[model samples]
Target chain A: LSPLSTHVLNIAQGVPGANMTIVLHRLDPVSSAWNILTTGITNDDGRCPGLITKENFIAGVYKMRFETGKYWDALGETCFYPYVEIVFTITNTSQHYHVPLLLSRFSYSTYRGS
Target chain B: LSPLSTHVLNIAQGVPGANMTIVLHRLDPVSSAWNILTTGITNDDGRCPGLITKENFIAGVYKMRFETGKYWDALGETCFYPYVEIVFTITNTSQHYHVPLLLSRFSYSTYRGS
Candidate 1:
């Protein structure tokens, strides 16, 4: 299983958030500056496969930035925010982190996932 | 139509999050305290009806507290957080606000619904 993964679902339209760009970032504990780890586009199922390999995984604070504005603009829709960002902590390296986003034009949410 | 409504869906079991307790709170702008407006339990469709009538609605910051721990305990599951809270602002009183939560045992997502 991918140690770090994500999925997106558009509840407003009841469809998978397909082909959206997701950027993963790792926060430097000392500098507090975020460094881009990797980026991927969600597939048809709204899943970003190979988001991060187990070998490259690290335990720290991370953020997932979804390009919601771009996604909705392409579909002829308007969004409240230009983008959606979720910041979370990963403490246990042995466990996997699955953060899925429930998206709509006006709102979004993310939580620690299985 | 209810000015404010909510729905909960359990993504892990692919079922509606029925019968979960949801408490609504309105932030008092002057005192900076929260006041309980009303409460409702989701029905079989995972929706809370009459959450707020148009007459009782006001333009302010609102918070929805979902008793996630209680819900999972009844199902014999472990949850990451005891409760899930969402705070949002309602600027346009004319529009209907639908906030839906997509939930799993260890994960959950909430979004503005149409």
Candidate 2:
């Protein structure tokens, strides 16, 4: 079984972005559309529990959506981004997929994580 | 007179991220320290009014820190990043400096905007 996972970190505070909402979606091949698969929230360490299960997953294109504006407002702060989304391609199912986000209200980054 | 400006966009929602807080800081060359210069928030168009005035500015390295965690919480969303920071250098004082952030809850991108 293949697995895909992600972790969120707040570079500004030098801590994990806890309780952040995340959604996973798969791109439709025929319709050029997006289909929601599952949603999860970040834990105390800015990670989701069992984001990717061993039962489901195949080599294909996937997207992760991050809800931004709501989270910042809760802290009595403002955010420049309403949400952030990352689109990536999963080529090899035999290997582990670790995608991480280093984010701020205005900036963010994603790469193949180990 | 040189001016520095920024704009934030929510890539996932395909819209501007308004009311986002941003801070500008200057890096100390010798001590490797950061000093806050000014702060601003994004308006309805995801931009700040008169972010950089003509009076101050020189060729140097600067950092823009975004308040991320707080913003996400306001939206009732959990975020992976606490905040995002961008360190960049201003090469020419005569040119206009435009730094824009395309952000998500999980990911973001920055570049010299025109």
Candidate 3:
């Protein structure tokens, strides 16, 4: 039962995106609406804990949105994005779903980590 | 008055993301939903045309979503994202908003280009 996890890297400052907020949403089967599956903040290592496990995982569309603006706001910098959202699907629970974000004040990136 | 433009580059194979579909939406004032502002496809240079001009520009929340999976599918590749959405604010019309995306099959990056 592989679990889902995420990490954030603050590329501009050459550090991890610590303390940034992350929200994971799963589309409801009947309602067809996004419901919060879990929420967590990045630790000092830029990783969020407790996203999903095989025991709790379901196959559906998943969205992981990052609050990057608030991260830069706390650092006293101007940001252009309100937030960053990465929408992916979780079809296989046998493998890890590690979605990582490389963030900056004006730029950001996300990928399905291997 | 500067305009808003975008470019997409396929970085994995080191080529431009030509023919990629893009949809720009503006947050509606009254409806409180998104309204399609414009639509375009990337040229050979990987740039979308007719996104926003000074004549049509207004300060609001703008979302530019790219059909990446479709692009990858056309290229005979698999992507993780269902789509890529970027949410940004427009505070000044004096500066051009060049939002460029550096894309790969599994990874993507976006930035406020110069």
| Chain B TM-score for all candidates, comma-separated | 0.96, 0.90, 0.93
Top DockQ prediction, candidate number: 3
Candidate 3 lDDT tens digits, B39-67: 88999999977787788788888999999
**Once superposed on the true structure, which residue ranges of model 3 sit more than 4 Å away at CA?**
A29-31, B29-31
What tens digits encode model 1's per-residue C-alpha lDDT throughout A2-106?
788888998889999999999998889799798998888999999998878788787777778888878999999877555666666676788878888888887
In order, the first chain's TM-score in every candidate is 0.95, 0.91, 0.93
TM-score of each predicted structure versus truth: 0.57, 0.53, 0.93
On TM-score, the leading prediction is 3
Instruction: Arrange candidates by DockQ, descending.
Output: 3, 1, 2
Cα lDDT tens digits for candidate 2, B2-107: 2888888878688888878999987786897888888988888988667666666766678777776567777787555556666666656777878887777766
List the candidates ranked by lDDT, beginning with the highest.
Answer: 3, 1, 2
lDDT for each of the candidates? 0.82, 0.74, 0.87
For model 2, the docking class works out as: incorrect
Task: Return the lDDT, model 1, position A6.
Answer: 88
Question: How well is each residue in A1-114 modelled by candidate 2, as lDDT tens digits?
Answer: 227778889876789988889999877878978988899998899887676666567666688787765667776775545566666666566777777777776556775664
Stretches > 4 Å off in candidate 2: B1-108, B111-114
